[PDB]
Design a binder for this molecule. Structure first.
Ligand SMILES: NC(=O)CC[C@H](N)C(=O)O
Ligand SMILES: NC(=O)CC[C@H](N)C(=O)O
Ligand SMILES: NC(=O)CC[C@H](N)C(=O)O
Ligand SMILES: NC(=O)CC[C@H](N)C(=O)O
Ligand SMILES: NC(=O)CC[C@H](N)C(=O)O
Ligand SMILES: NC(=O)CC[C@H](N)C(=O)O
Ligand SMILES: NC(=O)CC[C@H](N)C(=O)O
Ligand SMILES: NC(=O)CC[C@H](N)C(=O)O
Ligand SMILES: [Mg+2]
Ligand SMILES: [Mg+2]
Ligand SMILES: [Mg+2]
Ligand SMILES: [Mg+2]
Lengths: 150, 150, 150, 150, 150, 150, 150, 150
């Protein structure tokens, strides 16, 4: 990867729906070269794919909660818990964090009931779970994980 | 939005690079109808855009940290802090959470030095900040914010 | 329910001992209509009943305590604990709260001894209880759960 | 107050809509005596009034939250804060608790927005407030403050 | 007990080595009456005994520590733990406290080694103990438990 | 101080009301020697005095509370706070503890009101106080500060 | 040990590579005496040895972490855990601390992966471990354990 | 640096008092080469110096404490505090840690008094200090910061 690639990625991370011609005219290089560079970035896994950015509000994903999970030490219990947490519907992010030493889980649902039935009641029964603490999001000031190049 | 739209969105949230023909053959509807439905979803803001999903590791975004920020009460100091946090380079997520009552900040950097210079040292000088606590991510089990339809 | 009902409920939540005539003269509607509307609110369960508001001090309910209960995760142990907590004499409120993720219990007794014997010693032996923390109320600034319409 | 009064209060705390005749037949005393005893209990302030018990769900009071408030020490700042908290719409209970040494606030709203606008944003600007912590109620197992005699 | 008794107790709590004549001349009553009143206070257990107040420093009781003990819930485990804590040499005070809901233990030793061997290592092996936290006293500003009448 | 002194102190810490003859017969030494040794222990300040041990219950000292006080750093504010805490009526013990780094205050009162008026409301107004936390004693398992020799 | 020894130790703790002649000229004593005094300090174990001070940065020891370990009470489990912690590669310091009552572990590694594999994953499986909390060092302001004489 | 250097450093970190001949015979290389390699390691700053390892117990460094310091946010106040902490006599280690976000201070003294006078009372007056918490070391299981190569 060279500086040309960064300029390309810095544009695609925002809008992957530009024409090659428009991107070409912006970074000043042949469309054949641009097209070539994009293809290989994909091949080398720098670009893992293209997604449609859907507004969660539009799906009534109103009940947003960030949960901290403390796991029961022993083996084993740890990684095992990470994977059980990641397969719960509505959970889009699971992180093993230092600190505190436990898991941070990002999940979205339409209502309280849904959250309770799909997330809460389910996590309550997992064996390897010592204790959890939820932090309800009342306001999203920013959420742009797509922006990796500042 | 009807069930047909959900089927469309459930595919686009994964791969927005399918051909209309392939999506049409999958959900069984005229390409003209599919194309029409997608265009309006965009118009109604359900689909806010299309992004290239870039692998953070490929950019050496190694120092991942989740920071909790406690703000000084008064006015005012609150929203003000949210916006100052959101404009810091490397910060992609800022949430005002209940709970705890404070802000959860998601940020990525290549190294410790970068994190310290771009995030730490900067947050340390913000007036409205009472105290912060960082939780270093040592392992990402899952990160797919693009998946809104389970 | 319409605005007329709200005006009625806003009065009954305070004093259910007014005459229909007095309420009628206040909201300007036939007593037969008022009487009809009240009867159906009761039928539809909006009005669950009428209670006498008794001053707790008059019964020497001096030892007021708000207890937080952390439950042992597994199944099951959760709901089970909620119900065991709710049947303890002197306990009038039990809430499953997010946050913290555990139960908030409101209880009143005449003395410390009573509290210890009826609440403390009993909760100490419940299997599903991990740990509890009590917050003694030294002053009630306000307690009007009857007011649902502000 | 004698044991006869307790039997009366133990019934009125449940249903203040019984006929004097029915209560009389239950506790075995002249209706004139019963009527007399009730009148004086009211006079001596044991019975402060009669309320209609309204189902909060019926009013869409969905966003229930228990907030802990830590106050800035000095004077003065304390009682002052108690009263400012008690006059906020939606707040039905405010307690000064030992423990922890701070205030426990019970409040109900229809939604998150309402809670934020009526409670959150307002408490954030109060001078005497050091910090707050909210515990969202996801389930009410029991709420019968009307029951003072077990 | 009357006001005369309080005047007597208020003197004896300080110095039980005054002559009856000197106390008599101070509160203005016959020595026979004073002597009589003291004898009965002892009989009724108001005065449980007379002790020599020994300076702990003089015994090299240098390592003073206040320990909080969290007990494992179940039965039973509670009171049982209180008594095991009270029989440990060097422990002069054990309190079951609300709050926090656990035990506060006051203990004095000559050195760190002694504290570790007599208290620490011993408490570490008690079954009913969940966890403990010690607060080392680096300065005694006041310690006059003998003063009950202010 | 020699072993003979310890034997003497070990008896006086319990009951200072024994006759010299009885103590003499117990440790096997001339009454003149015993009397001499006691006199000098007093002179050297090993024995600071003799007190009457009064049962706190007998004075209705029912509201027992152990308070932790966090002080505002600066100078100065520290020692200053220790002394202000020690002169509050009902406070018999004040300790500066490591740990936690703050003050542990032992106080007794007859009721909640007294505690609030004499202790609470007073500490709330002290400038150098950052925050406090009270732990209500619901049971005294042991309180024998008079025993310094085990 | 006398003041002459302190002067010697105060120099050797800094630079053990001075010539005896240079140290002799500094403290003003015969080289034979100096040499004699050093030899015996070593014999009496005051001087346990001479080490080369290696810069950790030069070995890419970048991931520095201070971990707090809470142990499961019972016996036994305690000391046992101390020794298991001390034999983990990369761990140079293990302390049993009061306070908090648990272990403080100092460890250094080159990267996050190394830390996770050599420390984290290993501690996660130790039976006697209740829970741990890591504090990542982002800046070493000072680290001179070699300086014992100030 | 090559593997030969590591073998050399791995020996010098333990005992810098071996003869070049003995080290040469161990790693199998000419003494002239060994001597050359050591000289340059020193020049490149890999080896910063040679110290005498002094037993702290031998100096009666009995009062060992690990203190956590929370600093007042603003500027500036941060680094400033780090340096003020590092110049306090008895303090050998100061670390700025993530986590928690504050400073970890390692200090040793002979007694409690010394600790209070040299460390405590001094830190209490520093302006930029919000609060501190001390963890008394009652047992050093391991302390070998000199070992950088495992
Ligand atoms: N986009 C462009 O201008 C490139 C045109 C074409 N790829 C070429 O050969 O230059
Ligand atoms: N994709 C399709 O088969 C649709 C074809 C075209 N839109 C039509 O008129 O049917
Ligand atoms: N309260 C009233 O005035 C109503 C009277 C009666 N219900 C009617 O027919 O109007
Ligand atoms: N409720 C009753 O039976 C009482 C009747 C009436 N008060 C009487 O004189 O007895
Ligand atoms: N102390 C006194 O003066 C009392 C003297 C004696 N008890 C009497 O009969 O008065
Ligand atoms: N208590 C005694 O027996 C001592 C008596 C007296 N002091 C003596 O000269 O021995
Ligand atoms: N370093 C010195 O000057 C000491 C010399 C030699 N040890 C002597 O006999 O004095
Ligand atoms: N230590 C050794 O054997 C090395 C000897 C000498 N440096 C040489 O020329 O080989
Ligand atoms: Mg994307
Ligand atoms: Mg009611
Ligand atoms: Mg006494
Ligand atoms: Mg060294």
């Amino acid at each position: 990867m060279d500086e040309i690639d960064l300029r390309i990625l810095k544009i695609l991370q925002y809008n992957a729906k530009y024409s090659l011609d428009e991107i070409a005219r912006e970074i000043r290089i042949p469309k054949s070269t641009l097209s070539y560079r994009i293809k290989k970035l994909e091949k080398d896994g720098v670009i893992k794919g293209y997604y449609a950015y859907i507004n969660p509000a539009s799906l009534n994903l109103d009940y947003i909660v960030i949960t901290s999970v403390k796991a029961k030490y022993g083996k084993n219990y740890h990684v095992e818990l990470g994977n059980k947490l990641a397969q719960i519907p509505g959970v889009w992010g699971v992180y093993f964090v230092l600190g505190d030493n436990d898991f941070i889980v990002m999940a979205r649902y339409k209502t309280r009931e849904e959250f309770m039935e799909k997330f809460l009641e389910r996590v309550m029964s997992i064996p390897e779970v010592e204790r959890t603490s939820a932090q309800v999001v009342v306001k999203i000031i920013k959420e742009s994980p797509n922006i990796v190049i500042f």
